[PDB]
Amino acid sequence: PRAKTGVVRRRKHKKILKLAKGYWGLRSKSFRKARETLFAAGNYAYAHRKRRKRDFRRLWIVRINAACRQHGLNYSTFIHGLKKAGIEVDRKNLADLAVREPQVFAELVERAKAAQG
Amino acid sequence: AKHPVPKKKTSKARRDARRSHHALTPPILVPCPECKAMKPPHTVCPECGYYA
Amino acid sequence: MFAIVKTGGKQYRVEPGLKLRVEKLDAEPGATVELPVLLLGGEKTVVGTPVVEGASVVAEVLGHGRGKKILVSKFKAKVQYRRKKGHRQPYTELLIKEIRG
Amino acid sequence: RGEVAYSGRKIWPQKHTGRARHGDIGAPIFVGGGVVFGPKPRDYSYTLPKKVRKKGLAMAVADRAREGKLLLVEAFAGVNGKTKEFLAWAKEAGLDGSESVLLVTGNELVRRAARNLPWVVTLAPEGLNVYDIVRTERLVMDLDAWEVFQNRIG
Amino acid sequence: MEAKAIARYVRISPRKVRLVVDLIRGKSLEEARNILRYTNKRGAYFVAKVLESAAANAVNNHDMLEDRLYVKAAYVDEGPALKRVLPRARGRADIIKKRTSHITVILGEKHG
Amino acid sequence: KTYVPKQVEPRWVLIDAEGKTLGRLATKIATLLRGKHRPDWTPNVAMGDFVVVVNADKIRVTGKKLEQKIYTRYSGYPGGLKKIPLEKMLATHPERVLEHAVKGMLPKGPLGRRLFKRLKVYAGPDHPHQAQRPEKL
RNA sequence: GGCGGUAGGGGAGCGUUCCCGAUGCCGAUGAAGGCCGACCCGCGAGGGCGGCUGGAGGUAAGGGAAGUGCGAAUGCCGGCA
RNA sequence: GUGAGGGCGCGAGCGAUAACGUCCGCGUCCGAGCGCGGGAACAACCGAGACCGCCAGCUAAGGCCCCCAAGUCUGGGCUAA
RNA sequence: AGUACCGUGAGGGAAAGGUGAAAAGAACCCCGGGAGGGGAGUGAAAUAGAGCCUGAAACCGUGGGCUUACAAGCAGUCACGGCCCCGCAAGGGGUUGUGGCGUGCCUAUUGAAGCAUGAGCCGGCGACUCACGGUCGUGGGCGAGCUUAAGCCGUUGAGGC
Numbered sequence: 001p002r003a004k005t006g007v008v009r010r011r012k013h014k015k016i017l018k019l020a021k022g023y024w025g026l027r028s029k030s031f032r033k034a035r036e037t038l039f040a041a042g043n044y045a046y047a048h049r050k051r052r053k054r055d056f057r058r059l060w061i062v063r064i065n066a067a068c069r070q071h072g073l074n075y076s077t078f079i080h081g082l083k084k085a086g087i088e089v090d091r092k093n094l095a096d097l098a099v100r101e102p103q104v105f106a107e108l109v110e111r112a113k114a115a116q117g
Numbered sequence: 118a119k120h121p122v123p124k125k126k127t128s129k130a131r132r133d134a135r136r137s138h139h140a141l142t143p144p145i146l147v148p149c150p151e152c153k154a155m156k157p158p159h160t161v162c163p164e165c166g167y168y169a
Numbered sequence: 170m171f172a173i174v175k176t177g178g179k180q181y182r183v184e185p186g187l188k189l190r191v192e193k194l195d196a197e198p199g200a201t202v203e204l205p206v207l208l209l210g211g212e213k214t215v216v217g218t219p220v221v222e223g224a225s226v227v228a229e230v231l232g233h234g235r236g237k238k239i240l241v242s243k244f245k246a247k248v249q250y251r252r253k254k255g256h257r258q259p260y261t262e263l264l265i266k267e268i269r270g
Numbered sequence: 271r272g273e274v275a276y277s278g279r280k281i282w283p284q285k286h287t288g289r290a291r292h293g294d295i296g297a298p299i300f301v302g303g304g305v306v307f308g309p310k311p312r313d314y315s316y317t318l319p320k321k322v323r324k325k326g327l328a329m330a331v332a333d334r335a336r337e338g339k340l341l342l343v344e345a346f347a348g349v350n351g352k353t354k355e356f357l358a359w360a361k362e363a364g365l366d367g368s369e370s371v372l373l374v375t376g377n378e379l380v381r382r383a384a385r386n387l388p389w390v391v392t393l394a395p396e397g398l399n400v401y402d403i404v405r406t407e408r409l410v411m412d413l414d415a416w417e418v419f420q421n422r423i424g
Numbered sequence: 425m426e427a428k429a430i431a432r433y434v435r436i437s438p439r440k441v442r443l444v445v446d447l448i449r450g451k452s453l454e455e456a457r458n459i460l461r462y463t464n465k466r467g468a469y470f471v472a473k474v475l476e477s478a479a480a481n482a483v484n485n486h487d488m489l490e491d492r493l494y495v496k497a498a499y500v501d502e503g504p505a506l507k508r509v510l511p512r513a514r515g516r517a518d519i520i521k522k523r524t525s526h527i528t529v530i531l532g533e534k535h536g
Numbered sequence: 537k538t539y540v541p542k543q544v545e546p547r548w549v550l551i552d553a554e555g556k557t558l559g560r561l562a563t564k565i566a567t568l569l570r571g572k573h574r575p576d577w578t579p580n581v582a583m584g585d586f587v588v589v590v591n592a593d594k595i596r597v598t599g600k601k602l603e604q605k606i607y608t609r610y611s612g613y614p615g616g617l618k619k620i621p622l623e624k625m626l627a628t629h630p631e632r633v634l635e636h637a638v639k640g641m642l643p644k645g646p647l648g649r650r651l652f653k654r655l656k657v658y659a660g661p662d663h664p665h666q667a668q669r670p671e672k673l
Numbered sequence: 674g675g676c677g678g679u680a681g682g683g684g685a686g687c688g689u690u691c692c693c694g695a696u697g698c699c700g701a702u703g704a705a706g707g708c709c710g711a712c713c714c715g716c717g718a719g720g721g722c723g724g725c726u727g728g729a730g731g732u733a734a735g736g737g738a739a740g741u742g743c744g745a746a747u748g749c750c751g752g753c754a
Numbered sequence: 755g756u757g758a759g760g761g762c763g764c765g766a767g768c769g770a771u772a773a774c775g776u777c778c779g780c781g782u783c784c785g786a787g788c789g790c791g792g793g794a795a796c797a798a799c800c801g802a803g804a805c806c807g808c809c810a811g812c813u814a815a816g817g818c819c820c821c822c823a824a825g826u827c828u829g830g831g832c833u834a835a
Numbered sequence: 836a837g838u839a840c841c842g843u844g845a846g847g848g849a850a851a852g853g854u855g856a857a858a859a860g861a862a863c864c865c866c867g868g869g870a871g872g873g874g875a876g877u878g879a880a881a882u883a884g885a886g887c888c889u890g891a892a893a894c895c896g897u898g899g900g901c902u903u904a905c906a907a908g909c910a911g912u913c914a915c916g917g918c919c920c921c922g923c924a925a926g927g928g929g930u931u932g933u934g935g936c937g938u939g940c941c942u943a944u945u946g947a948a949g950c951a952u953g954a955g956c957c958g959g960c961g962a963c964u965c966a967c968g969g970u971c972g973u974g975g976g977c978g979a980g981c982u983u984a985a986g987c988c989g990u991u992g993a994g995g996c
């Protein structure tokens with residue numbers, strides 16, 4: 001019984017070569033190079049997922065300290081407010097209220113200023 | 118073969134790029150007073166003739 | 170009225186009636202669950218003690234569902250170390266209804 | 271790479287040649303070279319302990335007996351080797367062709383008869399063997415046969 | 425209706441004629457005849473010969489009016505190479521590829 | 537799913553200059569060039585204020601900076617490193633000081649360049665009185 | 674409650690060739706192979722479905738035996754750059 | 755399998771109270787954690803042991819004037835280089 | 836095919852198989868010196884048209900969609916926005932503007948993106964087997980026993996002695 005390669009290898013290559021569609025130049029036409037790229041990208045994506053968090057963690061903090069500044073306080077001071085004033089509400093994200101419903105935000109600014117000191 | 122030698126296969130893009138200015142241009146032709154045919158300027162041509 | 174509910178370990182606001190996908194939840198295929206877990210309102214309701222001591226949001230479990238597959242794919246160089254996991258994450262579809270405060 | 275038809279010479283020097291490095295086309299890394307641990311004729315047979323061979327035959331027969339398919343007979347009325355005969359004969363016997371029948375008998379003529387049938391496998395008494403037993407859904411045999419079966423194990 | 429015409433196996437390099445073809449693409453038939461006739465390239469000869477045989481077929485087989493058809497499209501693909509040796513100093517020997525061309529020219533009715 | 541801001545409209549400002557400390561002014565200034573004060577802010581977009589400075593010639597600076605603070609500038613040529621003390625800058629084109637001070641505090645990408653155009657520096661005061669001149673401090 | 678991992682030890686699986694299964698079943702209303710998918714099942718290697726090609730083969734469930742999986746060896750043959 | 759080890763802290767010899775030097779002892783990290791945050795960048799220095807997912811949350815070292823998250827924070831001194 | 840070719844010679848030693856059920860292998864006309872095309876015609880099929888079944892990949896080309904001439908780069912990846920294409924929809928597909936992040940694969944090594952090795956690219960060929968004997972584990976048969984070798988009879992995919 002001789003088991004020639006047969007279809008197998010082609011299929012494996014093509015399977016991958018699809019994954020690499022769109023990649024610049026020889027890096028989507030040659031199996032070998034595309035593969036090498038995918039390795040990297042796989043690791044990239046997975047590392048950037050963990051990042052996506054950090055990025056918005058920040059994006060929101062800027063907005064907050066932004067509109068939180070208009071009423072008259074540092075993000076630091078403002079946080080200390082709601083963290084002390086019981087409101088574990090507004091996961092930083094939902095302090096998007098600064099954009100729609102500024103009044104609601106403002107409510108949270110005095111509530112904070114107050115119980116803060 | 119000897120001393121200087123290309124370090125890396127020219128990219129198929131970087132190649133065609135070099136061929137930027139390679140395209141040709143149409144010959145400059147004109148209708149002649151003689152026949153209705155076309156001549157290049159300043160040139161006696163068949164089906165036509167000239168004058169002195 | 171805007172209404173911030175917490176659930177599946179994540180905060181989201183909610184409009185009177187609309188579809189929302191949330192971390193999978195233990196409930197019937199088509200039942201109803203309250204997210205008594207709720208903060209604020211569109212008529213200004215600072216959530217004092219973390220949660221409003223009295224308020225609720227009602228929603229219908231429009232159905233469960235998996236999610237488009239992601240390829241978690243580790244690769245450590247010089248060390249022939251490759252790993253390819255497929256991962257699709259479960260969830261459920263809440264249709265909002267009563268934001269009864 | 272020894273039995274292949276090529277010669278010994280070193281394809282080329284192996285030093286300041288720029289070419290790879292080699293001995294002779296025989297080398298299994300050539301296309302048209304020798305094969306590696308490719309197959310060579312070998313005896314696949316072995317000696318399965320006798321106790322076991324019998325146990326098997328007994329258990330095989332039995333399995334059919336316990337299934338009710340086993341059916342000893344002596345009444346072979348359709349004699350002269352002639353399929354039609356055995357055909358009609360099996361009709362009576364309750365063998366129609368809905369199930370495969372391993373027929374076992376001493377009489378070569380009964381053999382001749384059933385032989386050409388595509389749902390029957392003819393076989394002498396000494397031929398009894400698990401594979402054939404197991405193959406067919408239905409065992410049926412001559413008394414002289416069933417006897418020389420008990421002879422082997424009884 | 426469109427109207428094809430193809431010269432296979434034309435013994436000449438692709439890169440070479442492709443230059444001349446790309447000169448007539450999307451052109452008036454009469455203009456092309458004019459260009460090709462006077463354009464200075466070995467490739468003119470072949471591209472012209474086919475460009476013609478196309479118009480021919482266009483009229484005698486697909487009854488388009490010679491007076492209006494134009495170059496709807498026209499390309500040139502590479503046919504099998506033609507390899508020769510080329511003896512070289514100190515005994516090396518490069519193999520010179522004499523390439524070849526398939527030239528297509530499709531013509532179409534002037535307009536509507 | 538976080539809010540992405542739409543097409544806003546430039547808010548021109550008008551910062552003074554005289555008296556203000558070089559560094560400390562620049563700081564504020566850039567945070568306007570980037571929108572980072574406006575809550576509706578977003579990195580990828582670029583929508584900070586059109587800052588306009590006047591009388592930059594009257595920028596103050598602590599210590600011997602007028603003498604010590606030298607700028608470098610390397611022409612591609614050999615020995616082409618040409619240095620220049622703060623004095624000389626303020627003497628000649630002065631806004632130049634305030635300009636780079638800010639430039640050096642803007643992000644290094646393309647929009648960082650785009651952001652630089654947003655800044656109009658002078659010494660007069662008096663700019664081209666476009667429209668908005670909302671004074672600030 | 675544990676779960677980074679090279680050399681290495683252990684375990685479970687996927688796929689190629691061939692055999693029993695087979696005097697069978699799939700198959701021109703379309704076999705193998707090729708091309709294509711944003712679908713379905715599998716953690717995965719894979720498996721399935723659908724359209725296009727292709728024109729005659731293919732081979733379950735459960736087992737069995739191996740010339741059984743390639744990116745590299747200045748590897749070998751060919752094609753093209 | 756391994757029998758080239760490497761750096762760092764400490765304790766000695768050698769060395770010149772030289773060396774990304776060497777040679778032992780104890781420990782440690784890299785090796786195999788060139789995975790993640792800090793140190794501009796940087797195996798082994800500080801922080802921490804990555805099963806996968808999350809546009810949640812607290813903190814570690816480090817850091818909070820702008821590039822760059824977060825105080826141009828409060829109070830008392832010193833320094834003019 | 837021991838041929839072509841290589842070697843003075845002993846001697847080395849290739850590549851190269853497939854239309855179609857049938858030749859029905861394309862009369863005749865058309866452009867062309869011819870080759871080769873277009874039409875006509877044969878055929879179930881002619882992208883079966885003659886080194887002609889299938890016809891993959893690298894590689895070359897025409898057309899279309901998106902994008903690019905103030906930009907800094909292991910070519911990805913994460914986010915957002917534009918444009919084009921699917922779809923009742925919500926969604927989805929293609930492209931890439933800006934923003935964040937990011938030192939190729941293998942090998943060898945105390946340590947490599949490494950200015951250390953290997954690889955132009957693609958396709959196919961390519962490396963832990965087998966026999967006997969050992970040793971342990973393992974699924975069975977029998978057990979103070981267990982088992983047969985060569986061979987003989989039988990069979991021609993039958994076992995038995």
Ligand SMILES: [Mg+2]
Nearest residue numbers: 003004005006
């Ligand atoms: Mg193989």
Ligand SMILES: [Mg+2]
Nearest residue numbers: 015710720721
């Ligand atoms: Mg598939």
Ligand SMILES: [Mg+2]
Nearest residue numbers: 020021022023
């Ligand atoms: Mg992409």
Ligand SMILES: [Mg+2]
Nearest residue numbers: 036039040939
């Ligand atoms: Mg990589």
Ligand SMILES: [Mg+2]
Nearest residue numbers: 057058061092
């Ligand atoms: Mg945070």
Ligand SMILES: [Mg+2]
Nearest residue numbers: 098099100576
């Ligand atoms: Mg607003």
Ligand SMILES: [Mg+2]
Nearest residue numbers: 099100101102
């Ligand atoms: Mg509103």
Ligand SMILES: [Mg+2]
Nearest residue numbers: 137138139140
């Ligand atoms: Mg030009």
Ligand SMILES: [Mg+2]
Nearest residue numbers: 166167168169
């Ligand atoms: Mg005259």
Ligand SMILES: [Mg+2]
Nearest residue numbers: 221222223224
């Ligand atoms: Mg309550």
Ligand SMILES: [Mg+2]
Nearest residue numbers: 245246247788
């Ligand atoms: Mg790496």
Ligand SMILES: [Mg+2]
Nearest residue numbers: 246247248249
């Ligand atoms: Mg290694």
Ligand SMILES: [Mg+2]
Nearest residue numbers: 246247248947
């Ligand atoms: Mg490496």
Ligand SMILES: [Mg+2]
Nearest residue numbers: 247248249250
């Ligand atoms: Mg490896």
Ligand SMILES: [Mg+2]
Nearest residue numbers: 210212269270
């Ligand atoms: Mg109410």
Ligand SMILES: [Mg+2]
Nearest residue numbers: 275276277848
């Ligand atoms: Mg020979």
